Amino acid sequence: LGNTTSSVILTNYMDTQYYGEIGIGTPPQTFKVVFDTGSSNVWVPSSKCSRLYTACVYHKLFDASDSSSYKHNGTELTLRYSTGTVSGFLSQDIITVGGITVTQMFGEVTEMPALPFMLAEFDGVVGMGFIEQAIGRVTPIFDNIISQGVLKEDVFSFYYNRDSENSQSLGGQIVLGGSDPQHYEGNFHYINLIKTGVWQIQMKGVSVGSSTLLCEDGCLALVDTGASYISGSTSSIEKLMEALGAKKRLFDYVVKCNEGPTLPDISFHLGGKEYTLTSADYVFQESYSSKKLCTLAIHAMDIPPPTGPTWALGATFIRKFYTEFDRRNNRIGFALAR
Amino acid sequence: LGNTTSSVILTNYMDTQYYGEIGIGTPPQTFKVVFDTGSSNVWVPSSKCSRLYTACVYHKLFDASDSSSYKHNGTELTLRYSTGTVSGFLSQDIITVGGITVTQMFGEVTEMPALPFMLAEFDGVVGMGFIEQAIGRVTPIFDNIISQGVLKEDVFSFYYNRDSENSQSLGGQIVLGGSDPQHYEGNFHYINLIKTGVWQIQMKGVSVGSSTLLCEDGCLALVDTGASYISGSTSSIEKLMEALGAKKRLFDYVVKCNEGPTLPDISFHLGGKEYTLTSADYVFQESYSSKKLCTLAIHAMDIPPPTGPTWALGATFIRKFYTEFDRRNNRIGFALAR
Amino acid sequence: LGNTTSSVILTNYMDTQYYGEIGIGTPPQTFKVVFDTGSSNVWVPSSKCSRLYTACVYHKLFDASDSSSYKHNGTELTLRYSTGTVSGFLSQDIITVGGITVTQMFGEVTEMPALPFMLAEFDGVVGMGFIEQAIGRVTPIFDNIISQGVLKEDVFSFYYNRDSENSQSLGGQIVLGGSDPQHYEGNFHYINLIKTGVWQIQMKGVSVGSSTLLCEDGCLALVDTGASYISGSTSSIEKLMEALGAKKRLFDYVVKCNEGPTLPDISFHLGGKEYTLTSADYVFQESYSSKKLCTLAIHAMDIPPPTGPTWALGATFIRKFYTEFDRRNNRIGFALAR
Amino acid sequence: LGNTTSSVILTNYMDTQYYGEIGIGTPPQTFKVVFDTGSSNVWVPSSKCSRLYTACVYHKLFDASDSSSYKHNGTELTLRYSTGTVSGFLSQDIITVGGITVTQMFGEVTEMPALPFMLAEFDGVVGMGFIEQAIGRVTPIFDNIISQGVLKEDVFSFYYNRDSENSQSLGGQIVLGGSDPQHYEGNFHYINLIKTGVWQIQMKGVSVGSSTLLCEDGCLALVDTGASYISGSTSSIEKLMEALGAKKRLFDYVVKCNEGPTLPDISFHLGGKEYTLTSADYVFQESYSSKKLCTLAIHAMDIPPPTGPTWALGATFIRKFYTEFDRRNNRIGFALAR
Amino acid sequence: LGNTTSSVILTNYMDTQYYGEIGIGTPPQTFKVVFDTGSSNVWVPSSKCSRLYTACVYHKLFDASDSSSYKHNGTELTLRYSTGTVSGFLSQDIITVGGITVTQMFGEVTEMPALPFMLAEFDGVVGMGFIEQAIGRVTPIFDNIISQGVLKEDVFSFYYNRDSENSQSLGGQIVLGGSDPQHYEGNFHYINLIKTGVWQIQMKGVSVGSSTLLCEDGCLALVDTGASYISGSTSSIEKLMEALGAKKRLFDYVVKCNEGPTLPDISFHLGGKEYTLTSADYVFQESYSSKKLCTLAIHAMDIPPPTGPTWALGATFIRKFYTEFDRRNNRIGFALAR
Amino acid sequence: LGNTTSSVILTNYMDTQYYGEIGIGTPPQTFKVVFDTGSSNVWVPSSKCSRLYTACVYHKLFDASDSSSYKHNGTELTLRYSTGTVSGFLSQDIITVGGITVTQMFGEVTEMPALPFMLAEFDGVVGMGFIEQAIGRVTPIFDNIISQGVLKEDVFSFYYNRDSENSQSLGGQIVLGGSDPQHYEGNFHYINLIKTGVWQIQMKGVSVGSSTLLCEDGCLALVDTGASYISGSTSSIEKLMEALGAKKRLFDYVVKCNEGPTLPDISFHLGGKEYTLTSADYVFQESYSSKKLCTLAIHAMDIPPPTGPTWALGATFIRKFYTEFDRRNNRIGFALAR
């Protein structure tokens, strides 16, 4: 341990994508990345990404030939998420994350599909997960930063803000090595991980207003900074949505915008505490008109073993509760807001 | 040289005006002022300003008749900024800035144009530039603070925050006599002034996306805490804006609001570091609508000789990079703001 | 009879709620109320309304202990509407309605459900119906005002305006004791009530364009100032909507906004006259785009005996036709506009 | 004392300017003027106003050279309002106000600032305040009308309507010598002036929702027909706005438009009655959008001694309460407008 | 052939109607008309159009009695389009089209249905089709203009612009007698007509991204300047929409607005070339929100023999490709843009 | 009389300002100027303009001290337009307009009001009116060009384009000594000037839809290239706007944006031709929203004797009709622009 922290300011795109800058190379090539506790690899698109993929013409590409600290590896890799898949090869270089500099093995991505990566405002991903789930067992970036012995504590924290058209306010902030009390209130309460290797905790029930109608007898909750939404299994979400009176439009679940504020609180029972989102927290009140339909920030996602079936607590949850991921103690701390 | 630093808390109005409070006279008459490295005089509006100047109706007015420590001078002065002019006369009184008290000659302004000053939340200006550029050869406030030999270093530093809808967020901060490590990370990187007497450095190139398409044979950068935006020559900005796909209007440049988030990076090559802004840093993202127009915090400003032609790096730039102004070593230092 | 009238200016919320001020107590506690010909009791929320109900934390509460004219009664009551139900107890106090002061028994409401009363911009309800339908046979407020012998005529009238974003114009007006010719044109034509005790008239047919396709052989029409919409039985409305080419979205019936103006007039045959709404009168033209769906201000409502089955002519109808409720003659007068 | 009352019809521009017509000279030159209880001088723009004052280009100009009943005076005068200043010189001529003809000294204004006067639909001002506050000790118009002994009572009354998109709606009305019972209901309630010479009364408290949180040890209220809004001291309004959740901008305070309708009541305790405004009365509701900002008709205005510190009750207040100004008994009467 | 061209500037209404001015009569009565290669008759509404039809009260009517060049014919005619039907009688008069004057037989229309002609922003139609499909074998207007021998070439061209809220730019342009290179780039490539008498060409396939999944083994394509959209048979469009992942909302096919840019190019194989529309060309991106649904500018239309079954390439196609209809050579030329 | 024509390319700013470049002095100092048939003097802003005139800070300033061909005069002058006034003094220098060089007396302007000139993209004005209306009897530029006997005809012509978002579109064009057949079609139609000395013709009537409801006994039309709009007397425009259903605001008239496209034609009867504008020609269609307000390019302007009362036909009109100004025959010719 040392005496420093490093923060990275995040851009909020439409409350569904949150990303910040890293630099790769000497001199640094700068990319927009999602900092993702739900995966463990660092990747960006390659200058060798063939321009067949519209996604690669529309994102910043890493040119290894322009860095005097680049070292070749070549080993191939396929990274696949629950919503999309990328593929490429391993390279080594220096990565700057809020003026921490760290030598890191990462993926230069050469196959990058339009679905979904044309919708991505970010270029790549910095996996904040554990080595146990890293592809190619490449040492994750946070472990390499812990190895430097500069960070005040072996934790990192996430603030995700609510988007506003009347402010140019920060979209979010990640702090490596600690937390920022400006963005939460009170004190952390922690829930221990079921096992090291995944940012996943036991959940003891999910209530809709007055009744634990879901997850009686327990279920799993991934805390996923790379997911836009709160997610459940298709069956859990069907039942949640019936309880709310929301219905599947064509693609998504909606409520009449005026009735949004009549919807019940949703509480997630974690570590003896109730983490409660109100309807204002989980419905996109694009308006409050009785003539308009409004979407909810909750979706089905059937996550396969070994990680799933599980709920995923993504940006929707994180906007409400500032989150501290504690590697030393294998636990996740939450605090409100702000 | 002593052992003092004073900080002044600043208010951020709409990401365009940053100002703090000074007290003039006995008893103190308080004023909201911009601390401005692009000018070297102090002024506030005067009680002798005709109320046919509506700007004077809408601001705090120094009344000499209520100050027991006032000393008459009466010498005429006119101050010219690129967006407007003020005129009045010189007076001397005691000024408090962050618990430092200094006897100072300042302008009492009696002619204060509606455009731009009806649009100012601030009342006046504290010039932080050098005596060389002082109108009427009046000794600047920072030279007079140095002469007291209380300050630890002959330096001052600026932190400009992003806008907030929260009361708790600090709008910004000036430190007299040092820098605040709580608002920057990594290390300072320093560029020497072309010449003492102006806060202007050499700029080695401006790149927009993946091309050094501007300032290719070097140019000038004024580091200007009193400017809201980044500015360049009309021809430089025309070229810059062609590359962004932006439309020129009367006073600004706009893009379609849906286009904003995906506009390219802009980098400024200063003293052997690239200083990169993303679109989130220079677009006022107020909507994601394809039907609406979103302003960029970059504009044309043709500054004349001897200082210009020059780029000016204002609040758009300083928000991302904590800035230290070093009078001892005639240099400017940048570090990543937090 | 006397020589006075009393008017109360109404706020229009989104063309679906219309409410104005009454004061209760000495000194007066002011509430927002809907003036409702479809019920006969006065009620407001109580200071004794337990804060379990989010609705009670979000509405103004009557504190009996702060009125020197309050007299206890205690008798309990349940008031239930077609869309929601309230419950509480009877109290007596002085109620001011446009500077008429009247001693009135009313309900202090202690049970107030979030569905629908969290959507209510009004606090309570002033029932303008007859004693025959009053709960607890509490003398309705208008009968108590008639008893004073101050009103020029034993009638009351309603103006409901169309909402506009470009005006701060009156939302509506109720006149006790007469009418306001500024808000209608021409002369009233009256339809007699089927029976005293309910504001309900015989309807002789409903035509969609050129054909009385509905209510041949007669049907009932409640004139209901407490209802947002024109309503029919589920079967009547299914057939009306098929005739218009409107369809059930998920929650509501919609048309493409561009096709709104192609929809046929709807005429209600009352008292030998045709009361005609055009499509502009019954469709919420939130836009006129061929890319957008627009909702209609007509809904199904199966009203149970003894009052139903019946149509209900609520705000949608009243916006078109200024309405005079004539207690002396047991009839309802209509006139256009304006 | 005689048997005449004259009414003047007023135009309502956007709920912010209320003005009627006077005729000056022989033949009459007509002017749109605000009748203003917060000032005691009459002025109109002069033909001698330089056309470099754009405000003079855009208004009606009195030309002395076309009036056979003009009498020269020529004494300089300056008039200062809280939002701007006019300057010119004194002239005498015949003025007709509602079919009363009076010989009157008025200001011919030759200096008329673009801000605020380019934004005025009106040309000039008829001061209805007392001689005590008259600049240059000029006898006010109402004192000269009283001296004719034609008026029934030494009183005048104001009715300010809500805005309308209809041509038929009367914008407002001033009655000279009485009040119009057609535009108020219930009874007048009277408060005595602190002192003759100013239309200022004692205010006993200002409450926001269910709490007397302002003016708790009493304060001052100017009843100001020439002001658009209700105003308080900066500190009073900061506190008021904190309680409403409103954001301060340059010239106004805003809330999110969806929040407007549910903002609390504001009450003004005047002479043993509470005068209550709902949010519909003080919010310019232009939209119900969560993304838009809606202005409040309440602002900060620090009026200096001897008149201030004071609240000012302008058109926001007068729209709800018909106001009678009684010079005989040095009092102000309020009744509920209709 | 002569040496002139005639252009007519078109108004773009919502990207779905395009119309320009013609004058009929001496002196000219001016009408808004769609210039329609998909029909061959000229018609406008008649002054003799009974006002039963709301469409006729809402459009400009031709009064024969006010023209000194009107000559009676009387022969009746019914014109029916794929979306609506009109009926009336033949008249002769002088028609001015961009200052070409031509004696023309046209239909005075006396039966004009609200569906769809109440939605029409245009008054009438100028059929640019061949005599073979003219009703009453009335010589089409372009043949009568060719007969004058004034036009530089026996062709006419169409430019249709994309609508913009930030410009008052031209909606479109038709050029009789040639083309305007300001509105296309590069050189025409032509496809020959299957047969003279219809503006219809052979199509050799329609691909969605990478695969000719439609129209393998050939199909027909009408080039129809009177159609808003690209259309196919119901079966072709069902399959196209499944391939895109679009679905039938209630009335129309939609995609989530954010996913619009992920949709594949659509290429129409005509004359050995691929005419490619991107998703930006065929989806109405009224927004790009993940919370909103967006409609496509492609619809089913089962066109009956002898002309159909066929695709129709209407405004959606024409916006992308500037179109030259070449009567001399019986072919259609296309060029991009602009 | 010689054989030269010169064209000057104009820039279209927002359909409201049309201007081209002139060069003054040796070496040339370039200025953006409106070519204005409604005035007869040339002026540009002067370097002697006080920078307390913010308009002068924001425009190009003629500096006599940098011109070797300058000749002093110094005579004061003031120029009055209907929307503002400029003042300064006379100077002589060489002016180039489209490759014609002429020695010219012009105004150096030292007083330049913020309103309207802060809103001008142009710097100054080239008066194209007659010597009769020249302030200070200064010979107008076109009289001095004629005296060189280089021009083919004693005429000049104006083309004003519609606005564009394209760079390639020419904003407009003035031809000195002829007309450009590339920008008009059909034949010119000529009206003789009421009198030489003003570009004013007789107008025989103004019709709105199907009724000559204005200028029924004849009136005056100034053909004014320096005016943005069509203007009439206040009373004429009130009547015109009543017929359009438009609302009057401070500086303009608006309709609901959805109403814009269906507003009636307006025709101007000039010399035995009707000149017809559709709503597309005089509405700034920025939206089709029922909630938004759309400005008309028609306004009230009361021009005084001897020139007025008069209508003025500005850019709204000239955009549709190519205009030739014939000094040889004292007439104005119109043809349909293309």
Swiss-Prot record, chains A, B, C, D, E, F:
Interacts with ATP6AP2. One of its GO terms (cellular component) is extracellular region. Its main location: secreted. Its EC number is 3.4.23.15. Glycans are attached at N3, N73. This is Renin. It comes from Homo sapiens. The gene is REN. The keyword Coiled coil does not apply. Belongs to the peptidase A1 family. The active site is at D36, D224. Disulfide bonds join C49-C56, C215-C219, C257-C294. The keyword Lipid biosynthesis does not apply.
